[PDB]
Amino acid sequence: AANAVANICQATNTQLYQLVEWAKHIPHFSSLPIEDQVLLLRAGWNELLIAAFSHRSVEVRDGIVLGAGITVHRNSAHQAGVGTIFDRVLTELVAKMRDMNMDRTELGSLRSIILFNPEVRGLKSGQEVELLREKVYAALEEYTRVTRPEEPGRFAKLLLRLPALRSIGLKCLEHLFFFRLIGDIPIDTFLMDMLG
Protein backbone atom coordinates (compact mmCIF):
# COMPACT_ATOMS: atom_id res chain seq x y z
CA ALA A 1 0.00 0.00 0.00
CA ALA A 2 3.01 2.26 0.54
CA ASN A 3 4.31 1.47 -2.93
CA ALA A 4 0.90 1.07 -4.50
CA VAL A 5 1.81 4.46 -5.95
CA ALA A 6 2.88 2.76 -9.18
CA ASN A 7 -0.20 4.51 -10.58
CA ILE A 8 2.37 6.47 -12.60
CA CYS A 9 2.25 3.45 -14.89
CA GLN A 10 -1.38 4.36 -15.58
CA ALA A 11 -0.39 8.04 -15.84
CA THR A 12 2.16 7.33 -18.55
CA ASN A 13 -0.46 5.01 -20.03
CA THR A 14 -2.80 7.99 -20.17
CA GLN A 15 -0.02 10.03 -21.77
CA LEU A 16 0.67 7.39 -24.44
CA TYR A 17 -3.04 6.87 -25.10
CA GLN A 18 -3.23 10.63 -25.62
CA LEU A 19 -0.32 10.47 -28.03
CA VAL A 20 -2.31 7.89 -30.00
CA GLU A 21 -5.47 10.01 -29.86
CA TRP A 22 -3.50 13.08 -30.91
CA ALA A 23 -2.08 11.18 -33.88
CA LYS A 24 -5.52 9.87 -34.85
CA HIS A 25 -6.93 13.41 -34.86
CA ILE A 26 -4.13 14.59 -37.14
CA PRO A 27 -5.49 15.13 -40.69
CA HIS A 28 -4.91 12.25 -43.13
CA PHE A 29 -3.31 10.07 -40.43
CA SER A 30 -6.31 7.79 -39.91
CA SER A 31 -6.69 7.55 -43.69
CA LEU A 32 -3.44 5.63 -44.25
CA PRO A 33 -3.34 1.89 -43.38
CA ILE A 34 -3.13 0.67 -39.78
CA GLU A 35 0.26 -1.02 -40.20
CA ASP A 36 1.66 2.30 -41.41
CA GLN A 37 0.08 4.09 -38.44
CA VAL A 38 1.59 1.66 -35.95
CA LEU A 39 5.01 1.89 -37.61
CA LEU A 40 4.92 5.70 -37.61
CA LEU A 41 3.86 5.93 -33.97
CA ARG A 42 6.40 3.32 -32.88
CA ALA A 43 9.16 5.14 -34.76
CA GLY A 44 8.25 8.63 -33.57
CA TRP A 45 6.90 8.50 -30.02
CA ASN A 46 10.15 9.70 -28.42
CA GLU A 47 10.56 12.88 -30.47
CA LEU A 48 6.81 13.54 -30.30
CA LEU A 49 6.62 13.20 -26.52
CA ILE A 50 9.75 15.26 -25.92
CA ALA A 51 8.44 17.94 -28.28
CA ALA A 52 5.15 18.17 -26.40
CA PHE A 53 6.79 18.08 -22.95
CA SER A 54 9.49 20.60 -23.85
CA HIS A 55 6.80 22.90 -25.23
CA ARG A 56 4.93 22.51 -21.94
CA SER A 57 8.08 23.24 -19.92
CA VAL A 58 8.36 26.79 -21.26
CA GLU A 59 6.56 28.32 -18.28
CA VAL A 60 8.91 26.62 -15.80
CA ARG A 61 12.63 27.02 -15.12
CA ASP A 62 15.18 24.20 -15.00
CA GLY A 63 12.51 21.52 -15.33
CA ILE A 64 10.41 19.39 -17.67
CA VAL A 65 6.70 18.83 -17.08
CA LEU A 66 5.44 15.35 -17.93
CA GLY A 67 1.72 15.39 -17.16
CA ALA A 68 -0.80 15.94 -14.36
CA GLY A 69 1.36 17.02 -11.42
CA ILE A 70 4.72 15.69 -12.57
CA THR A 71 7.60 18.10 -13.09
CA VAL A 72 11.07 16.57 -13.29
CA HIS A 73 13.79 18.95 -12.13
CA ARG A 74 17.51 19.11 -12.97
CA ASN A 75 18.67 17.49 -9.72
CA SER A 76 16.34 14.50 -10.13
CA ALA A 77 17.45 14.15 -13.75
CA HIS A 78 21.17 14.22 -12.98
CA GLN A 79 20.47 11.73 -10.22
CA ALA A 80 18.64 9.53 -12.75
CA GLY A 81 21.83 9.49 -14.81
CA VAL A 82 20.48 11.55 -17.71
CA GLY A 83 21.38 15.10 -16.72
CA THR A 84 23.08 15.49 -20.11
CA ILE A 85 19.90 14.87 -22.10
CA PHE A 86 17.94 17.00 -19.62
CA ASP A 87 20.21 20.02 -20.08
CA ARG A 88 20.25 19.37 -23.82
CA VAL A 89 16.44 19.44 -23.90
CA LEU A 90 16.36 22.58 -21.75
CA THR A 91 18.85 24.43 -23.96
CA GLU A 92 17.92 23.47 -27.52
CA LEU A 93 14.14 23.16 -27.18
CA VAL A 94 12.51 24.69 -24.10
CA ALA A 95 14.80 27.69 -24.46
CA LYS A 96 14.28 27.85 -28.24
CA MET A 97 10.49 27.51 -28.03
CA ARG A 98 10.38 30.15 -25.29
CA ASP A 99 12.58 32.62 -27.20
CA MET A 100 10.58 32.11 -30.39
CA ASN A 101 7.24 32.32 -28.58
CA MET A 102 6.42 29.15 -30.51
CA ASP A 103 2.68 28.43 -30.41
CA ARG A 104 0.75 25.16 -30.18
CA THR A 105 -0.14 25.07 -33.88
CA GLU A 106 3.49 25.45 -34.94
CA LEU A 107 4.34 22.71 -32.45
CA GLY A 108 1.48 20.65 -33.83
CA SER A 109 2.89 21.17 -37.31
CA LEU A 110 6.42 20.11 -36.37
CA ARG A 111 5.09 17.06 -34.54
CA SER A 112 2.94 16.36 -37.61
CA ILE A 113 6.15 16.38 -39.64
CA ILE A 114 7.83 14.01 -37.19
CA LEU A 115 4.82 11.68 -37.23
CA PHE A 116 4.67 11.63 -41.03
CA ASN A 117 8.08 10.03 -41.56
CA PRO A 118 8.54 8.27 -44.94
CA GLU A 119 11.99 6.99 -43.96
CA VAL A 120 10.74 4.31 -41.56
CA ARG A 121 11.11 0.68 -42.59
CA GLY A 122 8.22 -1.57 -43.62
CA LEU A 123 6.03 1.35 -44.62
CA LYS A 124 3.48 0.30 -47.23
CA SER A 125 2.31 3.77 -48.26
CA GLY A 126 5.66 5.52 -48.07
CA GLN A 127 4.96 7.96 -50.90
CA GLU A 128 1.55 8.80 -49.42
CA VAL A 129 3.24 9.50 -46.08
CA GLU A 130 5.72 11.76 -47.88
CA LEU A 131 3.21 14.02 -49.69
CA LEU A 132 1.21 14.44 -46.48
CA ARG A 133 4.36 15.72 -44.84
CA GLU A 134 4.71 18.11 -47.79
CA LYS A 135 1.15 19.28 -47.11
CA VAL A 136 2.15 19.97 -43.51
CA TYR A 137 5.15 21.85 -44.94
CA ALA A 138 3.02 24.10 -47.14
CA ALA A 139 0.41 24.70 -44.44
CA LEU A 140 3.14 25.63 -41.96
CA GLU A 141 4.85 28.01 -44.38
CA GLU A 142 1.49 29.67 -44.99
CA TYR A 143 0.89 29.86 -41.24
CA THR A 144 4.24 31.52 -40.53
CA ARG A 145 3.57 33.82 -43.48
CA VAL A 146 0.21 35.08 -42.21
CA THR A 147 0.97 35.01 -38.47
CA ARG A 148 4.53 36.36 -38.53
CA PRO A 149 4.71 38.45 -41.73
CA GLU A 150 7.66 40.38 -40.28
CA GLU A 151 9.71 37.27 -39.43
CA PRO A 152 10.55 35.94 -42.93
CA GLY A 153 13.08 33.43 -41.61
CA ARG A 154 10.78 31.84 -39.04
CA PHE A 155 9.81 28.87 -41.22
CA ALA A 156 13.38 27.58 -41.45
CA LYS A 157 13.78 28.37 -37.75
CA LEU A 158 10.87 26.05 -36.95
CA LEU A 159 12.22 23.41 -39.31
CA LEU A 160 15.63 23.58 -37.61
CA ARG A 161 14.17 22.18 -34.39
CA LEU A 162 13.64 18.87 -36.20
CA PRO A 163 17.29 17.74 -36.44
CA ALA A 164 17.73 18.69 -32.77
CA LEU A 165 14.67 16.61 -31.88
CA ARG A 166 16.31 13.85 -33.91
CA SER A 167 19.69 13.95 -32.16
CA ILE A 168 18.07 14.20 -28.73
CA GLY A 169 15.52 11.56 -29.72
CA LEU A 170 18.47 9.29 -30.47
CA LYS A 171 20.06 10.15 -27.13
CA CYS A 172 16.79 9.39 -25.45
CA LEU A 173 17.12 5.64 -26.01
CA GLU A 174 19.49 5.63 -23.13
CA HIS A 175 15.96 5.45 -21.99
CA LEU A 176 14.42 8.35 -20.20
CA PHE A 177 12.16 5.81 -18.55
CA PHE A 178 14.57 6.56 -15.70
CA PHE A 179 11.74 8.67 -14.32
CA ARG A 180 9.80 5.65 -13.15
CA LEU A 181 12.05 6.65 -10.27
CA ILE A 182 9.06 8.84 -9.43
CA GLY A 183 7.47 5.55 -8.32
CA ASP A 184 9.38 5.78 -5.04
CA ILE A 185 9.62 9.53 -4.39
CA PRO A 186 5.97 10.10 -3.41
CA ILE A 187 6.63 7.36 -0.82
CA ASP A 188 9.90 8.95 0.32
CA THR A 189 8.16 12.34 0.67
CA PHE A 190 5.30 10.39 2.29
CA LEU A 191 7.68 9.15 4.98
CA MET A 192 8.89 12.57 5.67
CA ASP A 193 5.18 13.15 5.01
CA MET A 194 5.22 16.04 7.44
CA LEU A 195 5.94 19.75 7.86
CA GLY A 196 2.98 20.49 5.55
Side-chain angles (χ1 to χ4, degrees), residues 84-106:
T84 13
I85 310 169
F86 191 87
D87 303 333
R88 191 106 127 88
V89 165
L90 254 50
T91 303
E92 305 180 20
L93 299 169
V94 175
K96 287 298 193 304
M97 297 167 178
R98 170 162 52 243
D99 304 333
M100 293 189 67
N101 193 15
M102 166 169 155
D103 60 40
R104 305 194 272 253
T105 125
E106 289 172 322

PDB file of all heavy atoms in Angstrom, residues 84-106:
ATOM      1  N   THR A  84      22.611  15.033 -18.804  1.00  0.00           N
ATOM      2  CA  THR A  84      23.075  15.494 -20.110  1.00  0.00           C
ATOM      3  C   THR A  84      21.917  15.766 -21.064  1.00  0.00           C
ATOM      4  O   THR A  84      21.809  16.850 -21.645  1.00  0.00           O
ATOM      5  CB  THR A  84      24.015  14.459 -20.759  1.00  0.00           C
ATOM      6  OG1 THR A  84      23.936  13.217 -20.048  1.00  0.00           O
ATOM      7  CG2 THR A  84      25.448  14.951 -20.740  1.00  0.00           C
ATOM      8  N   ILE A  85      21.058  14.766 -21.220  1.00  0.00           N
ATOM      9  CA  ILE A  85      19.897  14.865 -22.096  1.00  0.00           C
ATOM     10  C   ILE A  85      18.905  15.899 -21.570  1.00  0.00           C
ATOM     11  O   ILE A  85      18.233  16.572 -22.348  1.00  0.00           O
ATOM     12  CB  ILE A  85      19.207  13.498 -22.254  1.00  0.00           C
ATOM     13  CG1 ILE A  85      20.247  12.435 -22.618  1.00  0.00           C
ATOM     14  CG2 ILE A  85      18.102  13.566 -23.305  1.00  0.00           C
ATOM     15  CD1 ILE A  85      19.739  11.020 -22.553  1.00  0.00           C
ATOM     16  N   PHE A  86      18.826  16.024 -20.248  1.00  0.00           N
ATOM     17  CA  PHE A  86      17.944  16.998 -19.615  1.00  0.00           C
ATOM     18  C   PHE A  86      18.373  18.421 -19.966  1.00  0.00           C
ATOM     19  O   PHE A  86      17.563  19.233 -20.420  1.00  0.00           O
ATOM     20  CB  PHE A  86      17.951  16.802 -18.098  1.00  0.00           C
ATOM     21  CG  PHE A  86      16.879  17.570 -17.376  1.00  0.00           C
ATOM     22  CD1 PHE A  86      15.614  17.031 -17.212  1.00  0.00           C
ATOM     23  CD2 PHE A  86      17.140  18.823 -16.848  1.00  0.00           C
ATOM     24  CE1 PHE A  86      14.629  17.728 -16.538  1.00  0.00           C
ATOM     25  CE2 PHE A  86      16.156  19.527 -16.179  1.00  0.00           C
ATOM     26  CZ  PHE A  86      14.900  18.978 -16.024  1.00  0.00           C
ATOM     27  N   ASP A  87      19.655  18.712 -19.753  1.00  0.00           N
ATOM     28  CA  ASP A  87      20.211  20.021 -20.076  1.00  0.00           C
ATOM     29  C   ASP A  87      20.104  20.294 -21.569  1.00  0.00           C
ATOM     30  O   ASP A  87      19.810  21.414 -21.986  1.00  0.00           O
ATOM     31  CB  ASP A  87      21.674  20.107 -19.634  1.00  0.00           C
ATOM     32  CG  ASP A  87      21.856  19.820 -18.158  1.00  0.00           C
ATOM     33  OD1 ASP A  87      20.907  20.063 -17.384  1.00  0.00           O
ATOM     34  OD2 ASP A  87      22.946  19.349 -17.772  1.00  0.00           O
ATOM     35  N   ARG A  88      20.345  19.260 -22.369  1.00  0.00           N
ATOM     36  CA  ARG A  88      20.252  19.371 -23.820  1.00  0.00           C
ATOM     37  C   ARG A  88      18.839  19.774 -24.242  1.00  0.00           C
ATOM     38  O   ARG A  88      18.656  20.641 -25.098  1.00  0.00           O
ATOM     39  CB  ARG A  88      20.636  18.042 -24.473  1.00  0.00           C
ATOM     40  CG  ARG A  88      20.823  18.108 -25.978  1.00  0.00           C
ATOM     41  CD  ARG A  88      22.293  18.048 -26.359  1.00  0.00           C
ATOM     42  NE  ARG A  88      22.553  16.993 -27.337  1.00  0.00           N
ATOM     43  CZ  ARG A  88      22.463  17.155 -28.653  1.00  0.00           C
ATOM     44  NH1 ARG A  88      22.120  18.332 -29.158  1.00  0.00           N
ATOM     45  NH2 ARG A  88      22.716  16.139 -29.466  1.00  0.00           N
ATOM     46  N   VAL A  89      17.845  19.138 -23.629  1.00  0.00           N
ATOM     47  CA  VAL A  89      16.445  19.444 -23.903  1.00  0.00           C
ATOM     48  C   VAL A  89      16.109  20.865 -23.464  1.00  0.00           C
ATOM     49  O   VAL A  89      15.433  21.607 -24.180  1.00  0.00           O
ATOM     50  CB  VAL A  89      15.500  18.442 -23.197  1.00  0.00           C
ATOM     51  CG1 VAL A  89      14.073  18.965 -23.178  1.00  0.00           C
ATOM     52  CG2 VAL A  89      15.560  17.082 -23.877  1.00  0.00           C
ATOM     53  N   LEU A  90      16.600  21.243 -22.289  1.00  0.00           N
ATOM     54  CA  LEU A  90      16.365  22.576 -21.747  1.00  0.00           C
ATOM     55  C   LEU A  90      16.970  23.688 -22.604  1.00  0.00           C
ATOM     56  O   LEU A  90      16.414  24.781 -22.697  1.00  0.00           O
ATOM     57  CB  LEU A  90      16.915  22.668 -20.325  1.00  0.00           C
ATOM     58  CG  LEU A  90      15.899  22.668 -19.185  1.00  0.00           C
ATOM     59  CD1 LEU A  90      14.914  21.520 -19.328  1.00  0.00           C
ATOM     60  CD2 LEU A  90      16.630  22.587 -17.860  1.00  0.00           C
ATOM     61  N   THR A  91      18.108  23.404 -23.228  1.00  0.00           N
ATOM     62  CA  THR A  91      18.855  24.425 -23.958  1.00  0.00           C
ATOM     63  C   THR A  91      18.411  24.575 -25.414  1.00  0.00           C
ATOM     64  O   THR A  91      18.278  25.691 -25.917  1.00  0.00           O
ATOM     65  CB  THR A  91      20.373  24.141 -23.920  1.00  0.00           C
ATOM     66  OG1 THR A  91      20.814  24.064 -22.559  1.00  0.00           O
ATOM     67  CG2 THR A  91      21.145  25.241 -24.632  1.00  0.00           C
ATOM     68  N   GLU A  92      18.176  23.453 -26.084  1.00  0.00           N
ATOM     69  CA  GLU A  92      17.915  23.467 -27.522  1.00  0.00           C
ATOM     70  C   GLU A  92      16.436  23.413 -27.895  1.00  0.00           C
ATOM     71  O   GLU A  92      16.091  23.479 -29.072  1.00  0.00           O
ATOM     72  CB  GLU A  92      18.649  22.311 -28.203  1.00  0.00           C
ATOM     73  CG  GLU A  92      20.140  22.279 -27.935  1.00  0.00           C
ATOM     74  CD  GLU A  92      20.823  21.119 -28.623  1.00  0.00           C
ATOM     75  OE1 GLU A  92      20.246  20.578 -29.591  1.00  0.00           O
ATOM     76  OE2 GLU A  92      21.935  20.742 -28.194  1.00  0.00           O
ATOM     77  N   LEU A  93      15.564  23.287 -26.902  1.00  0.00           N
ATOM     78  CA  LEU A  93      14.136  23.156 -27.176  1.00  0.00           C
ATOM     79  C   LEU A  93      13.289  24.098 -26.330  1.00  0.00           C
ATOM     80  O   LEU A  93      12.676  25.026 -26.855  1.00  0.00           O
ATOM     81  CB  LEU A  93      13.685  21.711 -26.970  1.00  0.00           C
ATOM     82  CG  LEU A  93      14.360  20.688 -27.882  1.00  0.00           C
ATOM     83  CD1 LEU A  93      14.054  19.275 -27.420  1.00  0.00           C
ATOM     84  CD2 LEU A  93      13.928  20.890 -29.331  1.00  0.00           C
ATOM     85  N   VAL A  94      13.254  23.848 -25.024  1.00  0.00           N
ATOM     86  CA  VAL A  94      12.509  24.693 -24.096  1.00  0.00           C
ATOM     87  C   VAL A  94      12.932  26.145 -24.248  1.00  0.00           C
ATOM     88  O   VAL A  94      12.094  27.038 -24.407  1.00  0.00           O
ATOM     89  CB  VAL A  94      12.722  24.254 -22.636  1.00  0.00           C
ATOM     90  CG1 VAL A  94      12.042  25.226 -21.685  1.00  0.00           C
ATOM     91  CG2 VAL A  94      12.203  22.837 -22.427  1.00  0.00           C
ATOM     92  N   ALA A  95      14.243  26.366 -24.213  1.00  0.00           N
ATOM     93  CA  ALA A  95      14.803  27.686 -24.459  1.00  0.00           C
ATOM     94  C   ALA A  95      14.374  28.214 -25.822  1.00  0.00           C
ATOM     95  O   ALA A  95      13.811  29.296 -25.908  1.00  0.00           O
ATOM     96  CB  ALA A  95      16.313  27.653 -24.357  1.00  0.00           C
ATOM     97  N   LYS A  96      14.629  27.443 -26.877  1.00  0.00           N
ATOM     98  CA  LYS A  96      14.283  27.848 -28.240  1.00  0.00           C
ATOM     99  C   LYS A  96      12.799  28.190 -28.398  1.00  0.00           C
ATOM    100  O   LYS A  96      12.448  29.249 -28.923  1.00  0.00           O
ATOM    101  CB  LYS A  96      14.677  26.757 -29.243  1.00  0.00           C
ATOM    102  CG  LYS A  96      16.174  26.628 -29.486  1.00  0.00           C
ATOM    103  CD  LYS A  96      16.762  27.896 -30.084  1.00  0.00           C
ATOM    104  CE  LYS A  96      18.170  27.648 -30.605  1.00  0.00           C
ATOM    105  NZ  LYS A  96      19.063  27.098 -29.549  1.00  0.00           N
ATOM    106  N   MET A  97      11.935  27.290 -27.941  1.00  0.00           N
ATOM    107  CA  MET A  97      10.494  27.506 -28.029  1.00  0.00           C
ATOM    108  C   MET A  97      10.062  28.738 -27.235  1.00  0.00           C
ATOM    109  O   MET A  97       9.172  29.474 -27.659  1.00  0.00           O
ATOM    110  CB  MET A  97       9.726  26.269 -27.557  1.00  0.00           C
ATOM    111  CG  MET A  97       9.950  25.028 -28.408  1.00  0.00           C
ATOM    112  SD  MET A  97       9.330  23.529 -27.617  1.00  0.00           S
ATOM    113  CE  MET A  97       9.670  22.297 -28.872  1.00  0.00           C
ATOM    114  N   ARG A  98      10.696  28.968 -26.089  1.00  0.00           N
ATOM    115  CA  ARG A  98      10.385  30.150 -25.287  1.00  0.00           C
ATOM    116  C   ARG A  98      10.804  31.447 -25.984  1.00  0.00           C
ATOM    117  O   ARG A  98      10.041  32.412 -26.031  1.00  0.00           O
ATOM    118  CB  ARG A  98      11.023  30.059 -23.895  1.00  0.00           C
ATOM    119  CG  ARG A  98      10.944  31.358 -23.099  1.00  0.00           C
ATOM    120  CD  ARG A  98      11.179  31.150 -21.607  1.00  0.00           C
ATOM    121  NE  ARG A  98      12.410  30.418 -21.325  1.00  0.00           N
ATOM    122  CZ  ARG A  98      12.449  29.225 -20.739  1.00  0.00           C
ATOM    123  NH1 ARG A  98      11.323  28.632 -20.364  1.00  0.00           N
ATOM    124  NH2 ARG A  98      13.612  28.627 -20.521  1.00  0.00           N
ATOM    125  N   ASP A  99      12.019  31.454 -26.526  1.00  0.00           N
ATOM    126  CA  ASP A  99      12.584  32.620 -27.201  1.00  0.00           C
ATOM    127  C   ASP A  99      11.827  32.949 -28.483  1.00  0.00           C
ATOM    128  O   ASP A  99      11.706  34.114 -28.862  1.00  0.00           O
ATOM    129  CB  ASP A  99      14.062  32.383 -27.529  1.00  0.00           C
ATOM    130  CG  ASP A  99      14.888  32.030 -26.301  1.00  0.00           C
ATOM    131  OD1 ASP A  99      14.507  32.436 -25.183  1.00  0.00           O
ATOM    132  OD2 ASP A  99      15.923  31.347 -26.458  1.00  0.00           O
ATOM    133  N   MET A 100      11.321  31.918 -29.152  1.00  0.00           N
ATOM    134  CA  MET A 100      10.581  32.110 -30.395  1.00  0.00           C
ATOM    135  C   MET A 100       9.115  32.434 -30.152  1.00  0.00           C
ATOM    136  O   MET A 100       8.413  32.850 -31.075  1.00  0.00           O
ATOM    137  CB  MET A 100      10.669  30.865 -31.277  1.00  0.00           C
ATOM    138  CG  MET A 100      12.047  30.565 -31.821  1.00  0.00           C
ATOM    139  SD  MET A 100      11.984  29.235 -33.033  1.00  0.00           S
ATOM    140  CE  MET A 100      11.056  30.030 -34.344  1.00  0.00           C
ATOM    141  N   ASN A 101       8.663  32.244 -28.913  1.00  0.00           N
ATOM    142  CA  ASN A 101       7.243  32.315 -28.580  1.00  0.00           C
ATOM    143  C   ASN A 101       6.453  31.377 -29.490  1.00  0.00           C
ATOM    144  O   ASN A 101       5.408  31.735 -30.034  1.00  0.00           O
ATOM    145  CB  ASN A 101       6.721  33.752 -28.665  1.00  0.00           C
ATOM    146  CG  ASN A 101       5.358  33.917 -28.023  1.00  0.00           C
ATOM    147  OD1 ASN A 101       4.903  33.051 -27.276  1.00  0.00           O
ATOM    148  ND2 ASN A 101       4.700  35.034 -28.310  1.00  0.00           N
ATOM    149  N   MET A 102       6.988  30.172 -29.650  1.00  0.00           N
ATOM    150  CA  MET A 102       6.419  29.148 -30.514  1.00  0.00           C
ATOM    151  C   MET A 102       5.069  28.657 -30.001  1.00  0.00           C
ATOM    152  O   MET A 102       4.962  28.167 -28.875  1.00  0.00           O
ATOM    153  CB  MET A 102       7.415  27.993 -30.626  1.00  0.00           C
ATOM    154  CG  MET A 102       6.876  26.701 -31.200  1.00  0.00           C
ATOM    155  SD  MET A 102       8.259  25.597 -31.543  1.00  0.00           S
ATOM    156  CE  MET A 102       7.466  24.001 -31.460  1.00  0.00           C
ATOM    157  N   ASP A 103       4.036  28.790 -30.831  1.00  0.00           N
ATOM    158  CA  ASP A 103       2.683  28.426 -30.413  1.00  0.00           C
ATOM    159  C   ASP A 103       2.350  26.948 -30.620  1.00  0.00           C
ATOM    160  O   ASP A 103       3.152  26.184 -31.157  1.00  0.00           O
ATOM    161  CB  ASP A 103       1.626  29.332 -31.063  1.00  0.00           C
ATOM    162  CG  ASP A 103       1.630  29.263 -32.582  1.00  0.00           C
ATOM    163  OD1 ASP A 103       1.785  28.158 -33.146  1.00  0.00           O
ATOM    164  OD2 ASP A 103       1.460  30.325 -33.215  1.00  0.00           O
ATOM    165  N   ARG A 104       1.150  26.565 -30.197  1.00  0.00           N
ATOM    166  CA  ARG A 104       0.745  25.164 -30.177  1.00  0.00           C
ATOM    167  C   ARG A 104       0.439  24.614 -31.571  1.00  0.00           C
ATOM    168  O   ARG A 104       0.471  23.405 -31.788  1.00  0.00           O
ATOM    169  CB  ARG A 104      -0.452  24.973 -29.238  1.00  0.00           C
ATOM    170  CG  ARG A 104      -0.205  25.492 -27.821  1.00  0.00           C
ATOM    171  CD  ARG A 104      -1.257  24.998 -26.829  1.00  0.00           C
ATOM    172  NE  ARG A 104      -2.435  25.863 -26.760  1.00  0.00           N
ATOM    173  CZ  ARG A 104      -2.714  26.671 -25.740  1.00  0.00           C
ATOM    174  NH1 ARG A 104      -1.903  26.729 -24.691  1.00  0.00           N
ATOM    175  NH2 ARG A 104      -3.810  27.418 -25.764  1.00  0.00           N
ATOM    176  N   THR A 105       0.150  25.500 -32.516  1.00  0.00           N
ATOM    177  CA  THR A 105      -0.144  25.068 -33.877  1.00  0.00           C
ATOM    178  C   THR A 105       1.146  24.851 -34.666  1.00  0.00           C
ATOM    179  O   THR A 105       1.222  23.960 -35.510  1.00  0.00           O
ATOM    180  CB  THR A 105      -1.092  26.045 -34.606  1.00  0.00           C
ATOM    181  OG1 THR A 105      -0.495  26.487 -35.832  1.00  0.00           O
ATOM    182  CG2 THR A 105      -1.402  27.244 -33.724  1.00  0.00           C
ATOM    183  N   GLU A 106       2.161  25.660 -34.377  1.00  0.00           N
ATOM    184  CA  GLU A 106       3.491  25.447 -34.939  1.00  0.00           C
ATOM    185  C   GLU A 106       4.072  24.145 -34.400  1.00  0.00           C
ATOM    186  O   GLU A 106       4.642  23.345 -35.150  1.00  0.00           O
ATOM    187  CB  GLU A 106       4.416  26.617 -34.601  1.00  0.00           C
ATOM    188  CG  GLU A 106       4.080  27.905 -35.337  1.00  0.00           C
ATOM    189  CD  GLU A 106       4.885  29.089 -34.839  1.00  0.00           C
ATOM    190  OE1 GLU A 106       5.125  29.174 -33.617  1.00  0.00           O
ATOM    191  OE2 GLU A 106       5.282  29.934 -35.669  1.00  0.00           O
TER     192      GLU A 106
END
